[PDB]
Structure 1
Amino acid sequence: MTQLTGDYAASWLPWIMIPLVFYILPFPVFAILFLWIQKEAS
């Protein structure tokens, strides 16, 4: 075939979550996880 499809149920769900957990969410996650490792102990 010439596309990514899914015969499995809710085949629309990889369509959005592979972008989410791999190149949309990590930079927010790496920013939150950055703010935690570089906070003053005042």
Structure 2
Amino acid sequence: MTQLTGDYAASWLPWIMIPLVFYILPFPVFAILFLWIQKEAS
């Protein structure tokens, strides 16, 4: 075929979970993981 399909159940779910955890969510995650690495003590 010429397209990524899925015969398995809920085949719409890799369509959104693969962009989410790999290039949409990690730059938020690398921001939160940077705000406690470089957080100052008083």
Aligned residues: 42
More helix by share: 1
- Residue 27 of structure 1 deviates from its aligned partner by 0.0
Q: TM-score, normalised by structure 2?
A: 0.98
Identity of aligned residues (%): 100
- Inter-partner Cα distance in structure 2 for 1:36 and 1:20: 23
Q: TM-score, normalised by structure 1?
A: 0.98
Question: Which segments of 5 or more consecutive residues in structure 2 lack a partner in the other structure?
Answer: none
- Residue 31 of structure 1 deviates from its aligned partner by 0.1
Question: Which segments of 5 or more consecutive residues in structure 1 lack a partner in the other structure?
Answer: none
- Residue 36 of structure 1 deviates from its aligned partner by 0.8
Kindly report the root-mean-square deviation, in angstroms, between the aligned alpha carbons of the 2 structures. 0.3
